[PDB]
Amino acid sequence: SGFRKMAFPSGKVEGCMVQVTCGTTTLNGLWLDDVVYCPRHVICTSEDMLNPNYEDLLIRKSNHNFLVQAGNVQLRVIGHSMQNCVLKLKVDTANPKTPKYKFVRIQPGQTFSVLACYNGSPSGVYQCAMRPNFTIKGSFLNGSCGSVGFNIDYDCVSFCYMHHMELPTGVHAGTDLEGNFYGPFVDRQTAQAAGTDTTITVNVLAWLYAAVINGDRWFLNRFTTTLNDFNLVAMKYNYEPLTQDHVDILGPLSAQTGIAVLDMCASLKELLQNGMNGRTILGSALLEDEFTPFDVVRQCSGVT
Amino acid sequence: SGFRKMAFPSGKVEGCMVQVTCGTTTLNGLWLDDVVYCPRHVICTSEDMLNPNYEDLLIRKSNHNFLVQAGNVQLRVIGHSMQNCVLKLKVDTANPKTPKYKFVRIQPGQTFSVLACYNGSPSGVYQCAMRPNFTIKGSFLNGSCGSVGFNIDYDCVSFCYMHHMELPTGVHAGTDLEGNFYGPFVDRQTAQAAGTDTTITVNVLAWLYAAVINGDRWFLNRFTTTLNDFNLVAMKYNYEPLTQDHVDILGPLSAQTGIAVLDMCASLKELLQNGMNGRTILGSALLEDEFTPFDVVRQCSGVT
Numbered sequence: 050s051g052f053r054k055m056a057f058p059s060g061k062v063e064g065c066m067v068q069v070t071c072g073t074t075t076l077n078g079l080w081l082d083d084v085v086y087c088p089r090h091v092i093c094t095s096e097d098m099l100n101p102n103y104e105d106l107l108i109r110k111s112n113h114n115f116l117v118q119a120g121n122v123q124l125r126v127i128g129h130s131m132q133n134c135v136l137k138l139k140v141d142t143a144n145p146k147t148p149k150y151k152f153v154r155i156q157p158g159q160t161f162s163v164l165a166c167y168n169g170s171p172s173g174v175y176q177c178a179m180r181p182n183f184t185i186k187g188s189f190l191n192g193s194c195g196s197v198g199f200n201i202d203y204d205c206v207s208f209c210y211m212h213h214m215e216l217p218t219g220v221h222a223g224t225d226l227e228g229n230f231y232g233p234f235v236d237r238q239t240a241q242a243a244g245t246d247t248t249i250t251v252n253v254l255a256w257l258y259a260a261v262i263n264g265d266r267w268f269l270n271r272f273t274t275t276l277n278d279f280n281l282v283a284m285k286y287n288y289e290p291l292t293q294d295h296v297d298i299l300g301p302l303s304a305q306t307g308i309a310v311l312d313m314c315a316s317l318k319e320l321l322q323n324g325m326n327g328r329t330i331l332g333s334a335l336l337e338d339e340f341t342p343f344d345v346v347r348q349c350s351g352v353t
Numbered sequence: 354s355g356f357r358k359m360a361f362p363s364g365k366v367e368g369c370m371v372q373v374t375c376g377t378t379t380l381n382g383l384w385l386d387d388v389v390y391c392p393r394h395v396i397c398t399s400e401d402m403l404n405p406n407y408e409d410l411l412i413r414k415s416n417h418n419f420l421v422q423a424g425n426v427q428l429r430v431i432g433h434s435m436q437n438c439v440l441k442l443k444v445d446t447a448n449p450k451t452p453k454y455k456f457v458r459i460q461p462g463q464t465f466s467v468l469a470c471y472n473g474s475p476s477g478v479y480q481c482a483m484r485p486n487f488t489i490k491g492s493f494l495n496g497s498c499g500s501v502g503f504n505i506d507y508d509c510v511s512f513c514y515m516h517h518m519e520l521p522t523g524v525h526a527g528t529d530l531e532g533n534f535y536g537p538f539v540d541r542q543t544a545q546a547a548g549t550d551t552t553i554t555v556n557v558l559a560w561l562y563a564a565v566i567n568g569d570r571w572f573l574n575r576f577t578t579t580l581n582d583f584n585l586v587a588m589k590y591n592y593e594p595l596t597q598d599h600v601d602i603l604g605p606l607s608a609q610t611g612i613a614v615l616d617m618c619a620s621l622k623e624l625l626q627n628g629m630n631g632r633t634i635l636g637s638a639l640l641e642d643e644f645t646p647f648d649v650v651r652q653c654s655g656v657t
């Protein structure tokens with residue numbers, strides 16, 4: 050009973066957080082095995098951020114310039130390399146708390162947990178969706194760079210995000226763990242356009258199924274629609290077009306509740322055209338798109 | 354930039370979760386030092402839950418009947434005692450992962466993180482407010498009993514909640530770590546009334562300050578009010594009456610933003626009387642009351 054914006058337990062990730070300092074800039078690093086991963090802008094001063102030549106900036110740095118502290122113990126840096134927008138600092142000690150892990154590049158619309166950190170210390174954890182425009186609407190302040198996003202499948206942590214930058218609009222941009230930015234962003238102090246964003250249709254449908262499972266059913270109606278008809282409504286309301294791939298992943302929720310996907314689409318169509326009329330769904334007065342069909346199944350079945 | 358429903362990092366609590374089985378009932382326990390705490394209803398069968406005599410039920414149990422498993426290792430139970438609605442199983446081994454901790458009884462309106470668990474394994478973490486009526490609107494299924502609520506101040510975990518029961522309305526009831534229920538609830542399979550709930554006024558005001566800090570300011574107006582006038586509006590809209598104690602704890606947010614508490618009360622009054630007019634505040638289309646003034650200061654300053 051109940052449905053919450055649940056994050057993964059952050060324990061396995063907390064054991065990997067370190068503080069990385071280079072010159073006068075300090076941020077977070079991720080220590081996995083004998084490598085520490087962090088945003089490459091740790092090598093920059095504020096003046097460098099205007100138009101940085103990272104290759105030239107990194108050349109002025111040696112292993113001893115990167116100070117890596119795991120809690121209260123100092124790591125010895127024996128190598129450094131830049132891969133895309135991340136630095137990889139080889140250390141002489143493998144992290145004893147390294148969980149089983151993978152580096153994954155998630156798709157837009159997928160969700161993950163963020164462990165916000167400052168000075169290598171965890172401050173909090175929250176669940177995010179990677180927006181269709183490849184930004185995240187996180188909660189990050191100066192010093193949070195290097196904080197990571199992740200998912201967990203039983204004992205394996207799949208790291209998918211490393212925080213790098215705050216856009217002038219207050220939304221967030223970052224990379225996968227190979228240092229490739231999600232979206233068009235560059236790690237430079239320049240105003241950068243995020244694409245037009247859209248609402249993640251398949252996620253709103255999954256959340257409507259979660260609402261029905263938990264008893265919030267007032268929005269169910271006597272109607273049905275087609276993918277074509279629904280997509281005309283999705284276009285008008287800036288929702289992602291629904292595809293058969295999306296219908297396919299909603300199958301488990303359709304089977305559990307007995308509500309055909311296109312019937313739920315008709316409820317969503319009516320909610321888009323008429324609003325909530327002052328009512329709520331799962332404690333929300335808007336259509337929530339930060340739960341994937343997998344998240345709904347996982348939470349509604351109590352997967353650990 | 355940004356403001357999220359952030360939970361504490363759950364790592365220190367994950368290290369304390371164990372599975373407790375007695376007869377054919379399995380639930381979660383909390384292993385701190387050499388004691389395992391769990392809901393006393395682990396000793397009941399479904400038939401016992403109708404009208405249980407816990408004292409008589411516990412008398413039929415011996416130390417060897419309580420099976421406590423921490424991950425994959427078995428704990429040896431050398432004592433058992435019932436304290437209010439919790440069982441305390443003395444074990445022969447102190448939990449090596451015991452963090453610095455305290456047991457606290459929180460007040461209604463205060464917030465905390467829940468680490469939802471099943472079979473002793475963590476499934477997810479979310480931030481909750483203890484409702485003014487002493488229920489929590491959690492996300493819990495069968496097997497989640499024994500999952501705990503907590504806050505963290507630097508290195509100290511203050512445990513404040515242990516999950517026990519789901520009311521017929523789908524809201525949740527539990528105890529402090531001494532086994533005293535929050536609210537009027539009893540651990541019995543009987544329909545039980547939760548009091549009339551109210552919105553946590555001081556928290557909505559704190560969240561309005563968080564919105565102003567992050568740039569959502571459309572709701573600020575040219576008006577002011579008094580505690581008496583605001584409280585007439587709070588009464589009409591089922592909000593908690595605001596006191597000078599509440600105004601006092603909003604002081605840091607009033608000082609940071611330069612918006613006097615009674616001026617923010619006038620914005621809240623107008624929002625109550627006119628609604629959001631289809632607009633949002635911090636990604637919400639309703640007035641959020643699950644962030645305390647302390648949570649707002651902590652998140653807006655990045656406290657670890």
Ligand SMILES: Cc1ccncc1NC(=O)Cc1cccc(F)c1
Pocket residue numbers: 090098189190191192193194213214215216235236237238239354
């Ligand atoms: C101040 C802040 C707040 C939240 N998240 C991140 C930040 N910090 C930055 O964006 C620094 C920065 C500037 C320009 C490029 C870059 F890659 C990184």
Ligand SMILES: Cc1ccncc1NC(=O)Cc1cccc(F)c1
Pocket residue numbers: 050394402493494495496497498517518519520539540541542543
């Ligand atoms: C089924 C479920 C779902 C979520 N949270 C909890 C539960 N389980 C219960 O309430 C069991 C129960 C019954 C009667 C009394 C009691 F103290 C405990």
